[PDB]
């Protein structure tokens, strides 16, 4: 809970804390869950490369 | 106290921290207490579906 690398955020009208795991190298990874996933794997991507 | 998924917030003129339990799946649940409740149950809803 302390290793969070606070980088930035801008919503300006709600204190909405998003669940996002961090990386030691200085990366911010969002987390998404979908029932249509195969349940036997975990995927990473960029949301624009696909 | 660390599992809070900081998503967003916007009041812009007061640092008002709201009591809101979080969910591992990435959900934000507000908390409300009313004396007129039956005292023997706990309700969930969407505030628009009713």
The gap between the terminal CA atoms of chain B, to the nearest Å, is: 31
Resolution in A for the shown PDB structure? 3.4
Task: Locate A40 and state its tokens.
Answer: 């036997």
Q: What is the C-alpha separation between B37 and B18, in angstroms, rounded?
A: 21
CA distance B29 to chain A (A): 11
Nearest to B2 among A1, A15, A20 (CB): A1
Note whether B10 contacts A9, CB cutoff 8 Å.
no
Sequence-separated (6 or more) residues with CB below 8 Å from residue B31: B19, B20, B21
* A19 burial type by CB count under 10 A (0-12 exposed, 13-18 middle, 19+ buried): buried
d(CA B30, CA B9): 13
Lookup: tokens for A49? 């490369």
User: What method was applied to determine this entry?
Assistant: cryo-EM
């Amino acid at each position: 809970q302390g290793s969070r690398k606070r980088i930035f955020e801008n919503t300006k009208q709600f204190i909405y804390e998003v669940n996002s795991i961090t990386d030691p190298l200085g990366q911010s990874y969002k987390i998404i869950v979908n029932r249509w996933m195969p349940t036997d794997a975990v995927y990473f991507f960029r949301s624009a490369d696909w």
